[PDB]
Amino acid sequence: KKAVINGEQIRSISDLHQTLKKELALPEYYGENLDALWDCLTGWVEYPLVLEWRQFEQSKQLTENGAESVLQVFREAKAEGCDITIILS
């Protein structure tokens, strides 16, 4: 499937996990943390998945340490053998 992180929209880390939640279609209890988001990639999201992350650094400041973590989990999961095409624009 595909995902898109539009920073111009992101207003905070919650927003980050919000769009990731829609794209990834995470449950309603999406813990939005790295442990939960991950818990989703390694056992919830369907792959191959695409993570078209737009405005990365822009979606990283607004939430000091916001977007650089979720990405770590998307690439790490990508490392787990999953096929999450990480697209950083």
Q: What is the CATH number for 35?
A: 3.30.370.10
> What technique was this entry resolved by?
NMR
Calculate the CA dihedral of residues 49, 8, 60, 13 and round it to 10 degrees. Answer: -80
Spatial separation of the C-alpha atoms in residues 42 and 65, rounded to whole Å: 22
Q: Which two tokens stand for residue 11?
A: 């207003």
What's the domain range around 7?
1-89
Question: Of 5, 7, 35, 9, which is closest to residue 21 (Cα–Cα)?
Answer: 5
Spatial separation of the C-alpha atoms in residues 70 and 76, rounded to whole Å: 10
Helix (H) or strand (E) holding 72: helix 67-79
Q: Position 56: which residue type?
A: F
Spatial separation of the C-alpha atoms in residues 7 and 13, rounded to whole Å: 11
6-23 burial string, b = 16+ CB within 10 Å, else e?
ebeebeebebbbbbbbeb
When divided into structural domains, the chain yields a total of: 1
Cβ neighbours of residue 38 closer than 8 Å, sequence gap 6 or more:
73, 76, 77
